[PDB]
Amino acid sequence: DANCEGDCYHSGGTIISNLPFQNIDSRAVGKCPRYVKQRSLLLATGMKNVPE
């Protein structure tokens, strides 16, 4: 596909993402986010939620 631009390729396609970590292919090549075993690591962008 010449409609999208990506720099991280693996045998199943491209990874276009600004995230530091990926979880798609440990053998991905190019300029890739680095592979983690974890499926999801949520970064807090707010305060403790103390509702009523």
Partner 1 sequence: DKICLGHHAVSNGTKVNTLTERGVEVVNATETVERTNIPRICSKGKRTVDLGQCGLLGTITGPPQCDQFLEFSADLIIERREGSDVCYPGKFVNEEALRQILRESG
Partner 2 sequence: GLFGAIAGFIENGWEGLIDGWYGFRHQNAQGEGTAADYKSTQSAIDQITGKLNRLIEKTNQQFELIDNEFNEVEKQIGNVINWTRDSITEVWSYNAELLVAMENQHTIDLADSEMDKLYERVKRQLRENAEEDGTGCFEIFHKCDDDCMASIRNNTYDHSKYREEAMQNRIQ
Residues that bind partner 2 (CB under 8 A): 11, 18-21, 26-27, 29-38, 41-52
CA–CA distance, 36 with 29 (Å, rounded to integer): 15
**Tokens encoding 40:** 């999801």
Q: Is position 26 an interface residue for partner 1 (rule: CB under 8 A)?
A: no
CA–CA distance, 26 with 49 (Å, rounded to integer): 35
Q: Is position 19 an interface residue for partner 1 (rule: CB under 8 A)?
A: yes
Query: Least Å distance between CB 38 and partner 2?
Result: 6
Residues 31-50 that bind partner 1 (CB under 8 A): 33, 36, 38-50
CA–CA distance, 8 with 22 (Å, rounded to integer): 10
